[PDB]
Structures are given as structure tokens and as C-alpha cells.
From a paper:
Collagenase from the gram-negative bacterium Grimontia hollisae strain 1706B (Ghcol) degrades collagen more efficiently even than clostridial collagenase, the most widely used industrial collagenase. Collagenase (Enzyme Commission number: 3.4.24.3) cleaves the triple-helical region of collagen under physiological conditions, catalyzing the hydrolysis of peptide bonds with glycine residues at the P1 position. It produces the collagenase Ghcol, which consists of 767 amino acid residues with a single catalytic domain containing the zinc-binding motif H492EYVH496. Here, we report the crystal structures of ligand-free and Gly-Pro-hydroxyproline (Hyp)-complexed Ghcol at 2.2 and 2.4 Å resolution, respectively. These structures revealed that the activator and peptidase domains in Ghcol form a saddle-shaped structure with one zinc ion and four calcium ions.
To obtain a homogeneous preparation, we expressed the collagenase module (Ala88–Thr646) of Ghcol with the Sec signal peptide using the B. chosinensis expression system and purified it from the supernatant. Crystals of ligand-free Ghcol were obtained. The space groups of ligand-free and ligand-complexed Ghcol structures are C2 and P21, respectively. Both crystals contain two molecules (chains A and B) in the asymmetric unit of the cell. In addition, the activator domain comprises two homologous subdomains, whereas zinc-bound water was observed in the ligand-free Ghcol. The structure is divided into the activator domain (Ala88–Tyr355), linker (Ala356–Gly365), and peptidase domain (Phe366–Gly622). The peptidase domain is further divided into two subdomains, namely the upper half (C1: Phe366–Val515) and lower half (C2: Val516–Gly622). Comparison of the zinc-binding motifs of Ghcol and ColG revealed that both contain two His residues (His492 and His496 for Ghcol and His523 and His527 for ColG) and one Glu residue (Glu520 for Ghcol and Glu555 for ColG) that coordinate to the zinc ion, and the catalytic Glu residue and one water molecule are located near the zinc ion. In this study, the overall structures of Ghcol and ColG are shown to be similar with an RMSD of 1.56 to 2.38 Å.
Numbering used by the authors: 90 to 622
């Protein structure tokens, strides 16, 4: 029943292995995020070697049907390498990894390694991940080829089999930083052939395994970087087959686009005659057009007329509330011709992930993106890009519609020059004002981050960056800092904006560093009255 993490903080391998098998894989999970005290005790080189030896002989005896103990043991072993990476106090001696490779081989060579089934899939998942976590990607290319060859609809029925076998592609990805692997990968013609066939299996399209086919396509495209190798004609032959068999937009385009993403990074699009696919993709994927007004155009993938209307109506609303709150006088900053805005809305975050990168040139591991372009250019039309979501705001249900729209208004009326122009950090303001103008006082997560005990000073908020993408600090605490100033010192907000509206970034920074000294006490008390009321 209950996890007892202290049992793992021990010098006895027997007590350690008793804790693994008796607490099971779900308690061993705690070791990933445990204190450096527990990690250092549990993941000594002695423990790893002894656990690996016992794991090797239990795996030799495996007779199918799954194993909670093996699952927990290989989970432990791969947790050690995780801790070895993140914990400086932890470095494995040279004789550990050969023993871990002994434990993995024992499972690989067991007659049941390629068994089908959900319980088996659970252990298999941990073994395949360990191949990656232990830097052994060079040792199992023939295992990858076997799994790619043997996969079929019967394996596909089990979630844990899909999840486990998908780990071969993470292994091919991880091999890039494995000098044995990159020394070997150029001769693996059988593996390349099996990757081609796996991705080209049309029965995976629109199935629960399509995502595996897309991963196979991606990993294949990475192999185009070995331009001289024995595998190079077959890699090229495989990529050509994928691009010609699947559409860039339609059923299976995740496979097409998966290949395109990596193949373009390591070779040129002209080899496969796919240069400039993004334009036809933009027209096919964003095939609806709705003209809100002469200043806002929507291009969308699949929205209803009612969503279009509610989106137009909501943006017109935010515009007038923005201009009143920011005291713009409707006067844009200088050298900004961004009178017209183009709004691009995909059907879902999945579609955004597939399509927005190529069409717009952006990262898509986020909730949306605003692209100001160059306001000084006559004919510049900025774009924000977003996706429909069930949890978005009715009646449009476009995730971050109001948020991105305020980015456009902020960029045109508060922030001189294009996006990269400032020479000081403006993240707290840009994101804070985008949240505050669009949510005003409805922000439960902002209240929550006050009540949970972890807080930020004004000084820390102003020095916030996108590094690590700390959503709490960026969006919640940016929101609080902005809201606090508009409520308690809106006249100081205008003094700041006099600077930002003229590009005077050093004066802007001197102004808000003054705030971080004057108003910290007032801000601290204010966040408390917010968490109380
Ligand atoms: Ca380390
Ligand atoms: Ca829709
Ligand atoms: Ca601007
Ligand atoms: Ca917090
Ligand atoms: Zn934003």
C-alpha cells in the first residue's frame, strides 16, 4: 500500500532490493525527484551493480506474462542514470554500465522478449527506456530492427506495447550523442529498410498507432545527415517514398510532415522536391476566410460562422477596453503601420503542432504565438496564430484569442519597434498586460500561486525571462505585478509607458527598478489581501 522512501536510503543492497520489489514500480517513481540525500544513498555504484546483477538473473528466469518486480527493477536502474545526469554528487564508476547492459541483455535474449501483451509491455517499456537512459543505443540496433519488422495489428491492440515499442525511436534520437552509435549507424541498411516499411504502412493512418509511423518518419529523416554512408541511398529511397505516398495536408500528413521536419534540417528540400510546400499547406490548412472588419481578418481551418462572429465581436470589445485602460488616445507608437491584423486559427493544438511550424516558422510547444513582423515596413501585416480548444472561452472557443489580440495592441500602442527591439527585459509586462487586459480579475491560478507559499518579489518579476519557460512566474506573477500597478499606481504605469512608447528602454528599466524598491512592501501586502478576499 504505502510508499516508504526511507527504505531506499540505505547501504544494504538486500534492503534496497527488498524495497524495490515490495514497494513496486509506483513507489520507485519517487526516486526521480527525491532529495540528494536519498538519491546518493540509493544510487551508489555498488547498489547499481548489485541490483543490475540480481535483475540479470531474474530476467533470465522470466517466463512471460509480465513482472511487477522486473518493472520496478529496470525502473530503478533507469532512475539511477536520471539521477546521475541531474545530480552532481552522483557519478557512476566505470563498472556499472557493463552490469546494467548485462541486465538489459538478459531480458533481450529471453525467449519471451518479443511477446505480445499489456503486462509484458509494462516491463518491456522500462527495458527499452533503460537502453536509452544508459547510453546503450549502439548496442541494440538489431532489437530496433526486430521490433519494427514484427510490429502488427495484434501488438497494436495493447497501449503498453505501443508505448514500449515507441521507445525505439527515442533510442535512435538519443544515439546522436553516442559516439559508438554514430560510428555504427551508417552501416545499418536492414534498420533503414525496416524504418521505411514501418512508416509506409498505410494501415496505420487514422489509427491509434499513426503517431508511431510519424516517429519512424522523423527518425528516418534524421538519418539523411549521413550523406556518405552505406545507408544513404536507402535513406533517400525511403524519404522519397514517404513524400510521394502521403499528402502534405490530409490523412497521414503527420507522417509526411514528420519526415519533412528532420530531413530539411539535415539536408536540403530540393533533394526530394518539397521546397515551398508551406504555401500550399497554408491555403489547404487555413481554408476558411472571415473578414471581421477592415482591420481584422480571420483565416481558419474549421470554425463555425457563430465562432467567427463571436471572435470578431470579442476582439472589438477588447480593443475599446484596451485603449481606455492603457490611456492610448488611440495613438499608435511611431514607425508602426500595423493597422491590419491577420488572425490564424487551427482546429486543435494537434493541428497547430503539425502545421504552424512550417507555415509560420514558429515553435509550437506553447498556447499560441503573435508575430508583429516589422511595423516600419509599409504593407506589413502582423499575424497571431492560435487553436480551438474545448476549455477556451465561449462563444468562440479559440484558446488565447483575447491574450494574443492584446499582444498585437500592446505591440502597436505601448512598445516601440518590433519584438526584438528592447534592450531590457519586458517579459513580465508583455505577458502580464496580455493576461490582465483579457482576464481583468478572473484569474484563479494567480490567486493559487499566492496561497501555495511560493511567491516572487517585484524585483524578481521584472527580471523574468522565457528561459526554462516558467509559466507560473511568467504568466501568473506577470499578471499580478501588472494588475497591482494598474490598481494602486496607474499614474506610474503611464510614466513607464512614456518610456516604452518611445523606445527608451534604459529609462523604462530605471523606472520599474524604482518600483521594486518602493512598492515591494505594498505589493506583498496586496497579494495577501488578494488571497484572503
Ligand atoms: Ca552527475
Ligand atoms: Ca473547429
Ligand atoms: Ca511595437
Ligand atoms: Ca507559487
Ligand atoms: Zn503571451
Amino acid at each position: 500500500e504505502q510508499c516508504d522512501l526511507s527504505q531506499f536510503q540505505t547501504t544494504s543492497s538486500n534492503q534496497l532490493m527488498a524495497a524495490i520489489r515490495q514497494q513496486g514500480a509506483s513507489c520507485v517513481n519517487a526516486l526521480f525527484s527525491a532529495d540528494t540525500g536519498v538519491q546518493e544513498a540509493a544510487f551508489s555504484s555498488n547498489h547499481m551493480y548489485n541490483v543490475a546483477q540480481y535483475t540479470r538473473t531474474l530476467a533470465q528466469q522470466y517466463a512471460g506474462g509480465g513482472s511487477d518486480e522486473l518493472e520496478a527493477l529496470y525502473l530503478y536502474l533507469r532512475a539511477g542514470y536520471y539521477a546521475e545526469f541531474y545530480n552532481s554528487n552522483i557519478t557512476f564508476l566505470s563498472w556499472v554500465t557493463p552490469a546494467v547492459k548485462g541486465a538489459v541483455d538478459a531480458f533481450v535474449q529471453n525467449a519471451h522478449f518479443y511477446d505480445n501483451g499489456d503486462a509484458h509491455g509494462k516491463v518491456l517499456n522500462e527495458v527499452i527506456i533503460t537502453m536509452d537512459s544508459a547510453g546503450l543505443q549502439h548496442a541494440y540496433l538489431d532489437v530496433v530492427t526486430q521490433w519494427l519488422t514484427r510490429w502488427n495489428a495484434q501488438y497494436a491492440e495493447h497501449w503498453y506495447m505501443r508505448n514500449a515499442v515507441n521507445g525505439v525511436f527515442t533510442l535512435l534520437f538519443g544515439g546522436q550523442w553516442n559516439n559508438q552509435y554514430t560510428s555504427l549507424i551508417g552501416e545499418q541498411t536492414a534498420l533503414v529498410t525496416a524504418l521505411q516499411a514501418f512508416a509506409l504502412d498505410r494501415t496505420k493512418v487514422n489509427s491509434p498507432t499513426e503517431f508511431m509511423a510519424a516517429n519512424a518518419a522523423r527518425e528516418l529523416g534524421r538519418l539523411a545527415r549521413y550523406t556518405d554512408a552505406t545507408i544513404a541511398p536507402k535513406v533517400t529511397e525511403g524519404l522519397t517514398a514517404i513524400f510521394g505516398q502521403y499528402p502534405s495536408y490530409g490523412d497521414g500528413d503527420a507522417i509526411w510532415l514528420g519526415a519533412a521536419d528532420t530531413a530539411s534540417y539535415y539536408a536540403d528540400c530540393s533533394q526530394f522536391n518539397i521546397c515551398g510546400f508551406e504555401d500550399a499547406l497554408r491555403d489547404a490548412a487555413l481554408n476558411q476566410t472571415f473578414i471581421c472588419s477592415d482591420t481584422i481578418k480571420i483565416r481558419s481551418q474549421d470554425m463555425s460562422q457563430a465562432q467567427h462572429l463571436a471572435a470578431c465581436d470579442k476582439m472589438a470589445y477588447e480593443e475599446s477596453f484596451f485603449h481606455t485602460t492603457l490611456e492610448t488616445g488611440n495613438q499608435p507608437v511611431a514607425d508602426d503601420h500595423n493597422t491590419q491584423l491577420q488572425v490564424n486559427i487551427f482546429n486543435s493544438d494537434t493541428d497547430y503542432g503539425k502545421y504552424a511550424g512550417p507555415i509560420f516558422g514558429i515553435d509550437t510547444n506553447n498556447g499560441g504565438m503573435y508575430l508583429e513582423g516589422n511595423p516600419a515596413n509599409v504593407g506589413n501585416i502582423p499575424n497571431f496564430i492560435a487553436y480551438e480548444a474545448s476549455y477556451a472561452n465561449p462563444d468562440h472557443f479559440v484558446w488565447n484569442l483575447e491574450h494574443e489580440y492584446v499582444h498585437y495592441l500592446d505591440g502597436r500602442f505601448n512598445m516601440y519597434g518590433d519584438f526584438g527591439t528592447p534592450t531590457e527585459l519586458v517579459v513580465w509586462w508583455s505577458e502580464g498586460v496580455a493576461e490582465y487586459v483579457s482576464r481583468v480579475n478572473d484569474n484563479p491560478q494567480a490567486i493559487a500561486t499566492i496561497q501555495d507559499g511560493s511567491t516572487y518579489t517585484l524585483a524578481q518579476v521584472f527580471d523574468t525571462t522565457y528561459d526554462g519557460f516558467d509559466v507560473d512566474r511568467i504568466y501568473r506573477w506577470g499578471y499580478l505585478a501588472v494588475r497591482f500597478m494598474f490598481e494602486r499606481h496607474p499614474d506610474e504605469v503611464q510614466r513607464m509607458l512614456s518610456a516604452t512608447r518611445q523606445g527608451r528602454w534604459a529609462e523604462y528599466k530605471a523606472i520599474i527598478s524604482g518600483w521594486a524598491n518602493q512598492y515591494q512592501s505594498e505589493f506583498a501586502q496586496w497579494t495577501e489581501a488578494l488571497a484572503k478576499g
